Amino acid sequence: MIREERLLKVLRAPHVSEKASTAMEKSNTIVLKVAKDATKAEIKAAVQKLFEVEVEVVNTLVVKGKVKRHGQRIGRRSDWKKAYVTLKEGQNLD
Amino acid sequence: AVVKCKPTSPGRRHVVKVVNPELHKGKPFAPLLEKNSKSGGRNNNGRITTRHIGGGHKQAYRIVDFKRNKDGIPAVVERLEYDPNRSANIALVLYKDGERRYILAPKGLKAGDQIQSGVDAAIKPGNTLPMRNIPVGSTVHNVEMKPGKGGQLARSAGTYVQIVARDGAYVTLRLRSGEMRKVEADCRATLGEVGNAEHMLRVLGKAGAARWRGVRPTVRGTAMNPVDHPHGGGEGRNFGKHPVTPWGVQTKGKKTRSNKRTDKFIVRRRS
Amino acid sequence: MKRTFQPSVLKRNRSHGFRARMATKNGRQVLARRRAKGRARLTVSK
RNA sequence: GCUCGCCGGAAGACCAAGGGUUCCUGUCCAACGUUAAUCGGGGCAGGGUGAGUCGACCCCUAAGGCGAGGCCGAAAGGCGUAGUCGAUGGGAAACAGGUUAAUAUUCCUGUACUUGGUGUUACUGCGAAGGGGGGACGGAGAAGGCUAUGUUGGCCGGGCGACGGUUGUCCCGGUUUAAGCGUGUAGGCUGGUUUUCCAGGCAAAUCCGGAAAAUCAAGGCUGAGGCGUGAUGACGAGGCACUACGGUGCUGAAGCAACAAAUGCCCUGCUUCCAGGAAAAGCCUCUAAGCAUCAGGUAACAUCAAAUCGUACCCCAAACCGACACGGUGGUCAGGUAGAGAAUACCAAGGCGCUUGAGAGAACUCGGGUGAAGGAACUAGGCAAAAUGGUGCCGUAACUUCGGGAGAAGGCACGCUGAUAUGUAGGUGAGGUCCCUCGCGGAUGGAGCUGAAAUCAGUCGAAGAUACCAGCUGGCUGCAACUGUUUAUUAAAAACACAGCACUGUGCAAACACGAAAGUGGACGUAUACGGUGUGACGCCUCCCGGUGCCGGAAGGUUAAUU
RNA sequence: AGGACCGAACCGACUAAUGAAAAAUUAGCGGAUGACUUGUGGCUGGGGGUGAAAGGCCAAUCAAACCGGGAGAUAGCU
């Protein structure tokens, strides 16, 4: 049982990319940016409540931040957690 | 028996094996085993405290019974076994009550021999009893110095002690060194000589053998530089000084016993 | 030719890392000194 | 794109460590790239790392670390008990195919497995900080059984030749398929089952150990591979539709047999040797306190569960350690022909041509090739080169510690073809036939397959161990017995070490060593042991105690604090 | 059987000629079942360690490491 408030905080964004699109189309799997602390179960819960859609399974991974250079000064982008969430057969997501 | 090995290589030429067939060809009694890791002759500070120790073969520790307290229960000798931890051979015995122990194998002992500890026990080889009960003139081994402690004198492959006298609460032992020593007469002792008496006839025959026995090589003080040893330095081979340890103390002759607490027990020093 | 530095992360950490430094008085002192100086990377710790 | 060349026990493929975006795409060429650069491991932007079963975490411990109390220490702190950490070791579980520009045992497809809860009905002794078993272990050697893998034939598809021949004993390609489940084999280990008692296993034990007694000779454990299923599937040479020339979608034959065969597996086995070969948990089992008709245990079945972190890419290197796009770096994989071979040569798969080129064809330098006659005359010195170089057989001195010396020396044979023998000796081994406690069984049987070595006869060349590969040999002699070790980076030796020898200390709270100490090593050793010193295999051997040391003595002389 | 023999890997470094290289190269060379070699982790600390002993090695540094401090040591010398 995850708290409503917690759930709302979990899910950061949808991730747009070719791969993501492919996943959506073929495998019925949505690619989300989620909180770095968000566990799989929590993510699933969030998905179910907040998008109103049955979840088969969630795979997560941590994306490491790229090191960049703004002019002369070096600086690193933040790490962030990506989640492939596979929706059950016949579940169409808006 | 001793066996001079045929010189099919140098390093085998001068080898003499001591091959006893009556030893157990097999894995030892595992309950009585325990771990025994190597020091490298280095103490808790991590410094080398005794030179020339290092390496050699992994060895288990056989838990030998030197206290020898199963009084009245007769044991029977199951087998003789190789112990890597000592010059003697050990013997796995089986008490009538079902317990097993390792003991130092004495001279005549073999599989099937019955042995017994206690005041009542028969004065025969391998039997153990207080030195007030043991007849004067007898050869004993595995001799306790303090009653109840466990055998400390005469444990090595072909050693034994003579009980020369029993004067009241003490008995006088003629130790293998030649030292005559008073010992409390209630101290325990095992009848006969300890076993593996042709141990001294073995000759390693190569450098490697020594190494296998965990003995690193020994450099001569005279081969060193003066900063290292008192004997060091000299152009060519010089040695114009009285022999001494690496720490400057005389080596040829200078006595080093300082124990004034046990001077009373020493009847006569060895010669 | 086998050069002197042959990196190993665990070894580095155990040797020089924060916790090791903390463990002893001299280590602590070193840390303090570093802090005083204004070091950004107080220890080897990543 | 087509040729050419190089690596191929790597200059290929996959990891660890280390790095940390170098990966992929688009885009830009100032700088960086030893030249140019449209290219890049460079700049900028975007994308990319998907796990119950791989690894970490986790449970367990080794060396070792920390260490409540504690012992010790001016202080700081040292050592260490209980404990708790610490892998490089022990501990549950996944395979095949398909897919991305870039991930995959992680996605998808198929087919699996594991150990937890929870609930069940069925049963009914459960229970640990304890007991026992197990885990649990060395070197070498030898086979035998296997597979990986390869070769040939069969089969299936395609081919009929840019130049003489090529419808055949011809040419090219393919002929692949897992874990799991079932079977429990080659083979290895052990005698089982029941009963009774017992000073043992810190207490108890129905467990282990020990005693008896009965009765049956098969009982159990282990075990590669094969076979079956998994699989009416998947993959499949290449054909056929579309084409953003990147590829996408459909389709799909055969898919067998024999022989050879590992250093891999059975094997943590067996045999043997002495130098005598981790630990703890998981796992099995036994009970105690306990609880007692409850919990807990095992039984299947249902359901839920398996979080977290790593996953790109380089990894003998242009990405790690070397200031550089410059030598070092642990593991795994190991095709063909020749060969003893992981050597060597040429190749496969795959990967590269080393980020300045173009000419010229002087001296001189580097790295190679050949050289008349002579053959060490060179030189400090045959330094360097040259030479020797294989298998089999014959043959082989002094001296010797009887092992050696010895590959001593020195010689002969060596290709190809045919025959012996349309392929032998051997190896393997199908049908058939017989037996049978019935199976992965035993006999007999020899088809097919594979296959040296030799002899005889012929034959070609200047030359047959034809290339690469691959000892120079002998004689006298110093030193050190020997194998070893050493001045990282001018010294590898006659130096150090060595087995052996001798002296000497040391009686165990050992001498000695590290420690203001506690303590630790010596050693869980005990004089056939340990320390120190010298000598240095083996053989034959090996006067002086005045000096300086050490040992013993203590009559006298001298002699501190103290008084 | 073997600190046995010939010989790749692997470990080394006797001879030779020659910055890519602050010790390498190519050609030969020694050991190659052991007193072998190697990965990972651990321990020993500066008059201290370790040393089959060369004053060797202890982070390209060694007859006393490096870093900071006493410290502007002292310098009848340049």
Q: What angle do CA A13, A94, A28 make, to 5 degrees?
A: 85
Structural domains in chain B, CATH included, are 1-113 (2.40.50.140), 117-194 (no CATH), 195-271 (4.10.950.10)
Structural domains in chain C, CATH included, are 1-46 (1.10.287.3980)
Cα separation, B38 vs B58, whole angstroms: 8
Contact criterion met (CB below 8 Å) for A88 and A55: yes
Q: What angle do CA B47, B50, B51 make, to 5 degrees?
A: 95
Contact between the CB of C5 and strand E at under 7 Å: yes
Greatest pairwise CA separation for chain B in angstroms: 71
Cα separation, B118 vs B138, whole angstroms: 17
Contact between the CB of B216 and strand E at under 7 Å: yes
Residue B1, both tokens: 């028996």
Chains that touch B (3 or more CB pairs under 8 A): none
| SS3 annotation, chain A | CCCHHHHHHHEEEECCCHHHHHHHHHHCEEEEEECCCCCHHHHHHHHHHHHCCCEEEEEEEEECCCEEEECCEEEECCCEEEEEEEECCCCCCC
Give the nucleotide at minimum CA-to-C1' distance from A23: D107
Contact criterion met (CB below 8 Å) for B141 and B106: yes
Q: What is the spatial distance, in angstroms and rounded to an integer, between the CA atom of B128 and the C1' atom of D6? A: 83
Chains that touch A (3 or more CB pairs under 8 A): none
Residue B144 CB partners (closer than 8 Å, separation 6+) = B150, B151, B152, B183, B187, B188, B189
Contact between the CB of B243 and strand D at under 7 Å: yes
Cα separation, B120 vs B116, whole angstroms: 9
Residue B150 CB partners (closer than 8 Å, separation 6+) = B66, B67, B68, B144
Extract the runs of DSSP E, i.e. beta strands, from B39-179: 61-62, 74-81, 90-95, 100-104, 114-116, 128-130, 139-141, 161-167, 170-174
Amino acid B3 reads: V
Cα separation, B22 vs B107, whole angstroms: 13
Write the DSSP symbol of residue B52: T
Residue B206, both tokens: 């190569």
Q: What is the resolution of this structure in A?
A: 9.9
Count other C-beta atoms under 10 Å from residue B259's C-beta: 8
Give the nucleotide at minimum CA-to-C1' distance from C7: D18
Partners of A31 in beta bridges? A84
Cα B101 to Cα B62, B108, B112: the distances in Å are 10, 18, 15
Method used to obtain the model: cryo-EM
Contact criterion met (CB below 8 Å) for A57 and A89: no
Radius of gyration of chain B (CA): 22
Identify the sign of the CA torsion C13, C19, C24, C27. positive
Q: Is B148 helix (H, G, I), strand (E, B) or coil?
A: coil
* Long-range contacts, B118-125 (Cβ 8 Å, 24+): B118/B71, B118/B72, B119/B71, B120/B72, B123/B191, B124/B191, B125/B191, B125/B192
Q: Considering only CA atoms, which of B119, B192, B196, B126 is closest in space to residue B157?
A: B196
Contact criterion met (CB below 8 Å) for A54 and A88: yes
- Protein-contacted bases of chain D (C-beta within 7 A): 17-21, 43-51, 62-66, 76-77, 79-80, 87, 100-102, 106-108, 132-134, 136-137, 198-201, 209-211, 273-279, 306-311, 320-322, 327-329, 401-403, 481-483, 495-501, 503-515, 519-538, 548-552
- DSSP one-letter string for B226-267: TTT-TT---SSS---S--B-TTS-B-SS-------SSTTTEE
- Protein-contacted bases of chain E (C-beta within 7 A): 1-4, 21, 23-24, 34-36, 40-45, 49-55, 59-60, 63-64
Structural domains in chain A, CATH included, are 2-94 (3.30.70.330)
Q: Considering only CA atoms, which of B51, B102, B32, B87 is closest in space to residue B201?
A: B87
